[PDB]
Amino acid sequence: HMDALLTKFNEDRSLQDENLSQPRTRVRIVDDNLYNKSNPFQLCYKKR
Amino acid sequence: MDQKASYFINEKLFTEVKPVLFTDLIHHLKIGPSMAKKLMFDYYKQTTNAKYNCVVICCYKDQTIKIIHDLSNIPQQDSIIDCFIYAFNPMDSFIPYYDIIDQKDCLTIKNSYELKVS
Amino acid sequence: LKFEKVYHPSILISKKRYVGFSYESPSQTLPIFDAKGIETRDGIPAQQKIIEKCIRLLFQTKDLSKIKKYLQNEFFKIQIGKVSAQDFCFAKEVKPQYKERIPYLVVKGKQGQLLRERCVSPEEFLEGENLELDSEYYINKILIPPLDRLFNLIGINVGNWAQEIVKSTTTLSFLIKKLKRQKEYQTLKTVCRTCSYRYTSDAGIENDHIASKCNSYDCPVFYSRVKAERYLRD
Amino acid sequence: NRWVEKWLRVYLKCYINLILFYRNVYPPQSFDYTTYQSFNLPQFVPINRHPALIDYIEELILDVLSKLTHVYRFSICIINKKNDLCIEKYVLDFSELQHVDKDDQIITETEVFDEFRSSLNSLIMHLEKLPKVNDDTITFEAVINAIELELGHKLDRNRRVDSLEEKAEIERDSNWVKCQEKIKLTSLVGSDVGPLIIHQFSEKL
Amino acid sequence: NRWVEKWLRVYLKCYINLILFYRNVYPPQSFDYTTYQSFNLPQFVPINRHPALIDYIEELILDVLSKLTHVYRFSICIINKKNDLCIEKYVLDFSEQIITETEVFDEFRSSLNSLIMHLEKLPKVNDDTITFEAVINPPKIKLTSLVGSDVGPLIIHQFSEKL
Amino acid sequence: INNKIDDISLIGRLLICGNSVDFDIKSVNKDELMISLTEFSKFLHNILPSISVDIMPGTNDPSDKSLPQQPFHKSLFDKSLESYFNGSNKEILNLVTNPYEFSYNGVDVLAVSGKNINDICKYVIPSNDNDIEHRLDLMECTMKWQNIAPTAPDTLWCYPYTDKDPFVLDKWPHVYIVANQPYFGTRVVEIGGKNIKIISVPEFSSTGMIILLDLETLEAETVKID
Amino acid sequence: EPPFGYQDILNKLEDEGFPKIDYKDPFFSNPVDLENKPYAYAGKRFEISSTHVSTRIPVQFGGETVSVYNKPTFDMFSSWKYALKPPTYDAVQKWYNKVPS
Ligand code: SF4
């Protein structure tokens, strides 16, 4: 089909110009929620 | 000239018949997904008596990502940029089985917090 | 002299002891059960229900291995502990007069074999073997109504069946068991609030407390909810 | 062993009920693709639930696994309502089994499930690649080409039977009858895992 | 003869009894399909419980296997109206020193399993308005063959031309 | 699968909300629960090198069937994946409840698995009806009053609510997540307290409509997975 | 081969003294029950039967039931077929039609 021809047309991204043994890490995620609070909705350890 | 991939696809297609979905290619070669699209296109280009064809995902998105089953039709993706070819299937249906694979070599995008053994 | 709904088999131990599949006309099918006059008193309902199902099974297809698996299943229900707990409700004449239907529910058994004939509290909140037991007097009192009424004339010993049955990931198993009886208890709460809708106008959020405070001595979901809430204290 | 005939039971469940699905001997709307009929399936195998029928299927598999060394070749026979002539004879094998040896090694759960998934997918492939004409009026029956058996006399000789396990065993020898003993034959890719050699083919007419 | 006589005579008597039940020459619920097994088989073996009729078919199969040594092509036709063609021709073709007792005793299972495969897979034209007649040689007939007896010394072609 | 390449740049840390494995309780047993849970382990150990995940049970996956619901560790995972939560305490994956206050240095967002509003939207509603644009505003209401939505709330034998922890809490988020609707719905409404974006992510068999959320200009982006 | 009668067979069965149409003794489908002996009964004999093929008396050809009473012999090439009638197309079809009803 011409779907394969679209892949034939798009030869510009040979490898996306990534090293590809380099992981480009994406996010500097903060996640302040995880450690320094009790979760109210969570169980009680003495109850469990 | 990367036929080093192609025979490995040939056993998994033929000598046993479990389909490749993506992950065998990334396990074998650790090539790019664009390069994997090129490789699967090359396998499609150098097809000789495929028992049945694959169906592609489409790179052109328009807030839609659909596996094509109306192969002749163009399902809401009319001004199409491209397609990523994968899921070459012997069977009637496209189901693989899913398994843990080596990923420390194969992970294209790593974790924002890398896991610690601690 | 009418015709009046003859029976294909008939159990015939005594005077005024009918039971057969009665049916008035040949055009009818699934012949009507007849329970007139029958010897099969207080009349604790589980004996009547197992005798009815046993006769229904013995009489629809004329086979006895299904009776075997049904009676063995019922002895598992008593033994392992899946008890609906309306199965045994005795009542003395201790206070015509209706100072009766007293709370006395002997399915409980005895922990230490200590209290003589005192399985009294029908909603006693404790663990497993003070709600179900295997070796007692009422296992004899449940093995005699099949044997005397039905199994005498056929000769098969249901007491031999009782004698044959009387002897003969895990945290995820406990988890999925809690899920099983949690969905069962929520289904019981659903049944209870749909039952208790007649006292609210249309409200549904206060339905839970009125559903929890329903106390019948005789209701076929209430005792299952009692043992459901017996489980959740653990 | 114990785990290996569980794998044989699941593999034969997949094989038998998949042949039942692709021959349209039961309506396809009763079938649904699934992984759980009493155990863990390797693939999503279209299984109709129909508890008499699945009782029959696990019955037949527990019959075939009961002998487990006489059988060198389990098979599935396909008979029309029109004639008793064989339409297809799907070949399976119980050759060089672990269970006859009773070797503990090796489990290789993912590897044996891998080769089972391969043989199932080959069964899928050569069950769509023959066409669909006269899709109804087909039935099912079993056949075993086995190397050294005769058990059917165990009903006889005035035996007195006491245990349910040998009640089952007398049902096993009761259910099986020796028959009286080509046109086309097609290839199928078998599983080639070490302890479970299942060299499975197909026959046509 | 030569030691196939006993299992051949019980095979024809049980074949007649199975024809009598599953094509209802007599009433279907006039039988006992419960307490008799013919060979080591799962299925029901419905002999007529009539002592005079079991003696009648006893003498029938006993005399046809008395004339076995020069017997001709065997059949059973069920007749109430004009059909004039054989229904179930279990042709007893006389062969002839092979020692086959166990194997032929197993072989009469598969003959009788081909019989029941012809019997339970069989339509219904009319209830009880038919009568059988053993004979040695319903709009339209139909051809159907069943299994042979190659393991047995005598081969039985076991044709059943229904209607 | 690449949008060349910006989809990876937008995507953050994986957030499921409820519905980890669909099943019905009266038809399930041991091994078919582990079949779907180990295939969930396959999925999560497949995606865990790529994207870190935060997981929550609560409507039809195993739970207390309450809004405060204990999230079940060590059951969703095979032995390959089981040792990661022992190795990494809460970073790459942790078990969180049906509500959770995910805070990105003060971008507090609330999750709901959906049952809390889906029982109101379909199961227990004879009245208050003048259907995505109707049901979108039911959880707007449930956000506004912070109130008792469901019919069996807080459902605990010991310590249900100790005058600190309402199941629909009192501290308000910037986005509430609710799940398992027929269609997609994503509006934003401003109140006198804060701004709140409405998130109704559909059930996955109802065409998915899978969503990006927040945190650049507080903007959401769905994509049709069918 | 002149047969017996047509519907009067039932009358003949009544005439020698048998039941005109037999109604079945309730039977054990599983033979591990009956405490694996028909002698287990009450003060009088009831001799409860079994429809399973282990506890069946054979067909009584004349005055004798017959088995081979001999050694079963193993065969080298032999195909063995299954004797249970399978559920049909029609049974599963009517069962899936019964699911909406
Ligand atoms: S337990 Fe009480 S409220 Fe519930 S259904 Fe029974 S009678 Fe009604």
Side-chain angles (χ1 to χ4, degrees), chain D residues 22-23 127-133 135 204:
Chain D
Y22 265 86
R23 288 300 99 219
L127 270 294
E128 76 263 11
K129 286 178 72 175
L130 73 164
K132 299 288 94 176
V133 292
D135 206 13
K204 265 282 269 182

Side-chain angles (χ1 to χ4, degrees), chain C residues 110-234:
Chain C
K110 289 283 144 293
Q111 300 273 115
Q113 278 181 349
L114 192 69
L115 293 201
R116 333 289 175 184
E117 210 80 14
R118 290 291 170 87
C119 313
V120 64
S121 300
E123 296 98 13
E124 199 265 335
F125 295 153
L126 195 61
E127 61 88 19
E129 64 183 1
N130 191 179
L131 63 91
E132 49 87 16
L133 201 55
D134 54 356
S135 196
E136 61 261 2
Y137 84 108
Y138 72 82
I139 205 71
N140 316 130
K141 260 308 189 185
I142 201 169
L143 65 87
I144 56 170
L147 191 149
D148 294 328
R149 296 310 104 203
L150 300 172
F151 286 154
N152 198 4
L153 60 83
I154 203 165
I156 316 293
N157 194 11
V158 75
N160 217 334
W161 296 358
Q163 214 287 311
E164 197 269 331
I165 196 165
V166 74
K167 287 163 180 58
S168 44
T169 305
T170 177
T171 61
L172 196 147
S173 312
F174 192 73
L175 190 139
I176 201 59
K177 197 253 187 177
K178 285 200 304 294
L179 270 294
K180 279 286 283 292
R181 55 193 302 149
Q182 191 153 20
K183 181 62 173 67
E184 204 270 334
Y185 168 66
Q186 284 266 40
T187 313
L188 290 175
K189 288 286 285 187
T190 295
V191 166
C192 276
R193 62 182 173 267
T194 47
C195 198
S196 173
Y197 173 67
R198 43 188 57 239
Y199 312 142
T200 191
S201 302
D202 219 347
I205 196 62
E206 202 63 29
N207 266 333
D208 298 317
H209 181 56
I210 187 171
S212 179
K213 293 319 158 214
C214 166
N215 186 18
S216 298
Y217 186 60
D218 54 356
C219 177
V221 287
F222 162 70
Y223 282 141
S224 52
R225 185 180 67 189
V226 175
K227 54 186 74 177
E229 288 295 276
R230 281 196 195 97
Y231 181 78
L232 266 296
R233 313 283 91 82
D234 300 330

Side-chain angles (χ1 to χ4, degrees), chain E residues 35 37 43 49 56 58, chain G residues 1-2 20 56-57 59 61:
Chain E
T35 185
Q37 97 277 20
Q43 67 268 21
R49 76 282 191 191
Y56 159 73
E58 173 75 21
Chain G
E1 323 299 339
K20 167 146 172 297
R56 302 188 163 159
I57 177 167
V59 289
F61 188 83

Side-chain angles (χ1 to χ4, degrees), chain D:
Chain D
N1 320 129
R2 211 59 72 180
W3 60 93
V4 59
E5 70 265 38
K6 280 155 83 83
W7 291 335
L8 290 171
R9 184 201 320 249
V10 179
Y11 179 72
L12 268 70
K13 204 180 303 307
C14 292
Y15 191 96
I16 287 167
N17 203 356
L18 196 149
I19 290 302
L20 298 168
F21 171 66
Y22 265 86
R23 288 300 99 219
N24 203 359
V25 303
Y26 314 125
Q29 53 266 19
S30 193
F31 293 92
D32 47 0
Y33 281 82
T34 181
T35 318
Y36 177 75
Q37 288 295 321
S38 78
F39 277 157
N40 54 3
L41 267 56
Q43 283 292 108
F44 274 57
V45 163
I47 293 183
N48 57 4
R49 275 93 67 197
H50 200 281
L53 177 50
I54 203 60
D55 188 74
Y56 186 42
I57 297 306
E58 62 86 20
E59 185 66 87
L60 190 139
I61 295 156
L62 201 70
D63 291 9
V64 174
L65 292 177
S66 298
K67 282 89 178 165
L68 205 45
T69 175
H70 307 287
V71 181
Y72 76 97
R73 165 174 156 154
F74 179 72
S75 289
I76 292 302
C77 196
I78 302 301
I79 43 163
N80 201 328
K81 283 94 151 179
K82 161 172 62 186
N83 49 1
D84 201 75
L85 192 65
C86 182
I87 315 294
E88 292 88 3
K89 182 177 310 205
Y90 298 104
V91 189
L92 189 148
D93 273 332
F94 280 99
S95 308
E96 299 102 9
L97 284 177
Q98 189 173 348
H99 208 299
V100 193
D101 196 20
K102 212 88 166 179
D103 197 1
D104 192 272
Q105 66 99 46
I106 192 65
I107 184 167
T108 51
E109 154 73 14
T110 52
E111 166 157 10
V112 69
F113 263 75
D114 179 83
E115 305 280 14
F116 283 165
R117 276 168 271 138
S118 310
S119 50
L120 275 296
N121 283 302
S122 69
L123 200 62
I124 296 295
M125 190 205 62
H126 271 159
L127 270 294
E128 76 263 11
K129 286 178 72 175
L130 73 164
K132 299 288 94 176
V133 292
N134 199 7
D135 206 13
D136 211 29
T137 318
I138 300 100
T139 53
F140 161 70
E141 69 165 352
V143 63
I144 296 180
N145 317 130
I147 177 65
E148 284 313 315
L149 74 165
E150 190 191 354
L151 290 179
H153 283 208
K154 205 57 65 192
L155 197 151
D156 290 334
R157 284 178 308 271
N158 216 354
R159 186 268 299 163
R160 195 41 169 267
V161 59
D162 307 295
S163 69
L164 180 57
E165 190 260 344
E166 69 172 0
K167 289 313 171 306
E169 183 48 57
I170 299 300
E171 171 80 350
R172 311 291 90 98
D173 54 67
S174 81
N175 286 351
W176 281 116
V177 297
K178 178 189 183 300
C179 75
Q180 56 104 24
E181 63 96 17
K182 193 194 61 164
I183 297 89
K184 271 81 72 175
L185 188 153
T186 53
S187 74
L188 268 169
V189 186
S191 76
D192 45 4
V193 76
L196 290 165
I197 300 294
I198 306 172
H199 192 286
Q200 61 91 29
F201 277 167
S202 45
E203 194 260 5
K204 265 282 269 182
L205 277 296

Side-chain angles (χ1 to χ4, degrees), chain B:
Chain B
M1 47 163 307
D2 190 72
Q3 284 309 97
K4 332 179 189 66
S6 286
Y7 67 92
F8 158 73
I9 307 301
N10 185 82
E11 293 86 5
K12 194 155 278 188
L13 197 57
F14 280 179
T15 71
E16 57 99 19
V17 289
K18 285 178 70 66
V20 288
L21 191 73
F22 186 72
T23 187
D24 295 321
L25 287 72
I26 191 68
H27 152 72
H28 205 254
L29 295 91
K30 301 100 181 183
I31 50 165
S34 162
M35 198 169 177
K37 186 253 287 182
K38 257 91 173 169
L39 175 64
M40 195 64 73
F41 173 49
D42 211 330
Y43 202 80
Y44 180 71
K45 186 58 64 196
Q46 302 273 353
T47 285
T48 307
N49 288 318
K51 62 184 78 68
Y52 196 68
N53 211 27
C54 47
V55 308
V56 310
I57 205 68
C58 177
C59 294
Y60 190 52
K61 183 254 290 180
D62 288 335
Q63 187 179 1
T64 57
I65 304 171
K66 175 69 180 184
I67 292 183
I68 308 300
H69 301 309
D70 299 9
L71 275 299
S72 67
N73 209 359
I74 305 96
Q76 286 187 299
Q77 291 166 350
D78 50 355
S79 64
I80 176 164
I81 291 292
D82 208 356
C83 309
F84 162 60
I85 315 171
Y86 81 112
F88 197 85
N89 65 322
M91 290 73 68
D92 280 332
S93 183
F94 301 98
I95 51 171
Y97 187 56
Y98 293 115
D99 200 67
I100 310 302
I101 207 65
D102 50 351
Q103 280 288 107
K104 302 295 186 291
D105 55 356
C106 294
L107 74 166
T108 65
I109 305 300
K110 79 179 180 184
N111 296 125
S112 177
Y113 280 95
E114 300 90 34
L115 60 89
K116 47 158 171 78
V117 187
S118 71

Side-chain angles (χ1 to χ4, degrees), chain C residues 27-44:
Chain C
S27 70
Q28 190 275 331
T29 44
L30 198 57
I32 303 168
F33 188 79
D34 200 1
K36 188 190 183 69
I38 65 179
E39 284 182 346
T40 76
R41 214 176 193 274
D42 277 8
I44 49 174

